[PDB]
């Protein structure tokens, strides 16, 4: 395809040595999933990692 740009959020600031950090960006993970329990800053990052972890399992 081609896709476009991202939203207009700035919730990806530095993160102290202990807090969660985005697994796709690299700043902070204010949000955390349940199944994967990963860390993300926005909602797009969440699915961006989930749909990426599924293909990694292969099959099905
Ligand atoms: Zn992010």
UniProtKB/Swiss-Prot annotation:
Query: Where located?
Result: Cytoplasm; Nucleus
Q: In which tissues is it expressed?
A: Expressed in fibroblasts (at protein level).
User: Which residue stretches are annotated zinc finger (HIT-type)?
Assistant: 18-47
Q: What is known of its domains?
A: The Q motif is unique to and characteristic of the DEAD box family of RNA helicases and controls ATP binding and hydrolysis.
Tell me how this protein assembles: Interacts (via HIT-type zinc finger) with the RUVBL1/RUVBL2 complex in the presence of ADP.
The entry's linked illness reads:
Orofaciodigital syndrome 5: A form of orofaciodigital syndrome, a group of heterogeneous disorders characterized by malformations of the oral cavity, face and digits, and associated phenotypic abnormalities that lead to the delineation of various subtypes. OFD5 patients show the core features of cleft palate, lobulated tongue, and polydactyly. Additional features include frontal bossing and intellectual disability.
The record's similarity note reads: Belongs to the DEAD box helicase family. DDX59 subfamily.
Please identify the protein, giving its name as recorded.
Probable ATP-dependent RNA helicase DDX59
Which residues of the entire protein appear here: the answer is 94 to 146 of 619
């Amino acid at each position: 395809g081609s896709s476009g740009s991202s939203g207009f959020s700035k919730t990806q600031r530095w993160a102290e040595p202990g807090e969660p950090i985005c697994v796709v960006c690299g700043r902070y993970g204010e949000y955390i999933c349940d199944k994967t329990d990963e860390d993300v800053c926005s909602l797009e990052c969440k699915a961006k990692h989930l749909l990426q972890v599924k293909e990694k399992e292969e099959k099905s």
